[PDB]
């Protein structure tokens, strides 16, 4: 009985794993019993959890083992690669499938989470100190990049201006989902004196989404008035944010307890509800500005406990981020291997991004930013995120409803170039800003 | 602006309510968005929450306001009355409905929870000190009460012995769901020296359910062999409990952290899975003994942290109890007002309960219990619980499948008398034992 005596003391190396496996299988059985639909290996909820775990392990691997010597390996590239691998394997694409509506809802939820996290961390008096530079950085470079991309596309691909206008509007847009965490980390660190520069970027790269989607919708309609519709959407979002601000302003008082969890849940639910209501009513994207205005008003309410809830919101964002990246990167199966002289698209997107950098450097030549701040701001505006993927999916769906072969091919080319741009410029830009933060604004 | 100045300081009296209402409506909207099915006011999940809240408020009212001077008002009566009111109002019965399968699953879950809570709190060495009295109290009085009830029914109602046998088997059964909390509270209190008496009752009033259901199934089949089937079920339950005991015995070790939550979740999930597997395979009720054996083995594992998990399991049971009572009491709509000379049924059930008390006093005349312990044990075995309702529902469903009018009427009479017995003897017995605990075994 030597083996029995030796194995009598439990071995935590071989005991922890068994306990974890038993707990996981028990939870999975409970989930299956509660709902036998979309919980099987061929279901959606199983696929969501599998994608979440794959994104988590990919992010860990891209940064814990094969990270470069000086620059750490960002997890964004790992998450995008995991999504690409999940989507682009036929034998591992039929087993795991996700509903389009669920994907869109999760994308909206993640965008609302990152927007409210950015708004909560914003510092006051920045608007009064320098709002003009923020407004110019929000307005100018987006339109300039869209126009330059349209010009570059024209006389190059042969598509009419309507397709060129749509491509320029789609490409010329930066979504804060990829840049906000970097700005928040930089502000938490701090180099020299942060004279509102991180908050400046956070505010500037937030509400250009409404203008981008308005232009895209107008161009799509012309390819098939609404500028006033978008203006009304902006006004409605501002008014809703102003109205909702007075609620967190007073209802949470010192009398109540557990203010952290209650306030965080309240603001997150309000943001999600506003975004979903705006999308359902018929004018999506206004909730994106509404939640930012609500967070700004909550800061104006002098909550004095931002860091109490900032930690919880940061944890929630860290949970949601791999899911968001996997959802974005797991919708490229159609063009998995379609070489159609993609080098033209690569050249167009690269030239457009370079023009964006140049104009962003031009847009910050007024005052304050001498050299290093100019360069950092220019390189910070570079990346793009979920907004481009969502608008491209909408454009492709519209094209494949009453369109012929030529329009289908044009939409396919636009979707491919947009996906490639999202794949390239986002993680490279994130790594660049992460490495340049401690190296430019010290 | 006098009103504005006066209302400028928030009033927590009028502010807490608004915040709670906003949180509740936000959660309800989230639930509706996640699932638009069975979450509407006409759905099931809405009905479950409404029943839970009604049971909670009824239990609070029956004990916080209209409690008698010396004896506090038990909440069991309030919960049963709330269930009766919910079920027996046509305009408030169509709006809230609950699936039969969901009700049965929740009943099984609650029974498993109370069984594992009883088993965890059991004290060792009690079996070796006096197991014979426990075995006799488990076996004898159940069969004697069933036989006496059958005899009383015969020559009284005119139904044949097959119906009389079924009625006696159904009536002659005590389910621990109503007595275990009282025993645990009494053991926590302690009067003089508790020489295993509470644990004796907890063990004795646990595994008679298998014998009761086996007899009921055999009688139902005869009305349409299985004794060996029930014996095999008991053996299978014992073997499964023995096998599962070695798992909590070693897998949770000192290396792991958060032992309380992990162990509690593990044991609860194992009990639920065992009960559901036993029910699905074709031999229900064996999991009821299996979970008790598993808890006894976990105690034999010297967990030394029972009170750490006993608190959590007690909280879970306190959550589930109003739901269980509401589910039991919300299935009497058919016979809401059907006076069919019910006094005969009342007399039969009263005589049967009195005979149960007399034989229980007779069964404890061996040793140890001198006078007061005898009386307390006799009065403790009195109540009945969910088991009778479940078996009566099964009997009625079997009757209304291939049966004629006479069999339907017999089944209806049996169901009515069973419901009346559950209504009467359970809360009265609970209040009696609660008041007599500090007054008999001091």
Author numbering:
A (entry chain A), B (entry chain B): 70 to 293, 300 to 517
Q: What do the study authors state?
A:
The bison NHA2 construct used for structural studies is referred to as NHA2ΔN, because it does not include the first 69 residues of the N-terminal tail. The bison NHA2ΔN sample preparation was subsequently optimized for grid preparation, cryo-EM data acquisition and structural determination at pH 8.0. The final cryo-EM map of NHA2ΔN in detergent was estimated at 3.0 Å (Fourier shell correlation (FSC) = 0.143 criterion), although protomer A was consistently better aligned than protomer B, and was therefore resolved at a higher resolution. The observed additional N-terminal helix TM –1 is part of the dimer domain in NHA2ΔN and is domain-swapped, mediating homodimerization by interacting with TM8 and the TM8–TM9 loop in the neighboring protomer. As a result of the tilted angle of TM –1 and the length of the connecting loop to TM1, the NHA2ΔN protomers are held apart by ~ 25 Å on the intracellular side. Before masked refinement we also observed additional map density for a predicted short helical segment prior to TM −1, which sits at right angles to the protein. Finally, the modeled N-terminal extension helix is also highly positively charged and is reminiscent of the positively charged extension helix seen in the oligomeric betamine transporter BetP, which binds to negatively charged lipids in response to a change in cell volume.
The Na+/H+ exchanger SLC9B2, also known as NHA2, correlates with the long-sought-after Na+/Li+ exchanger linked to the pathogenesis of diabetes mellitus and essential hypertension in humans. Here we report the cryo-EM structures of bison NHA2 in detergent and in nanodiscs, at 3.0 and 3.5 Å resolution, respectively. NHA2 consists of 14 transmembrane (TM) segments, rather than the 13 TMs previously observed in mammalian Na+/H+ exchangers (NHEs) and related bacterial antiporters. The additional N-terminal helix in NHA2 forms a unique homodimer interface with a large intracellular gap between the protomers, which closes in the presence of phosphoinositol lipids.
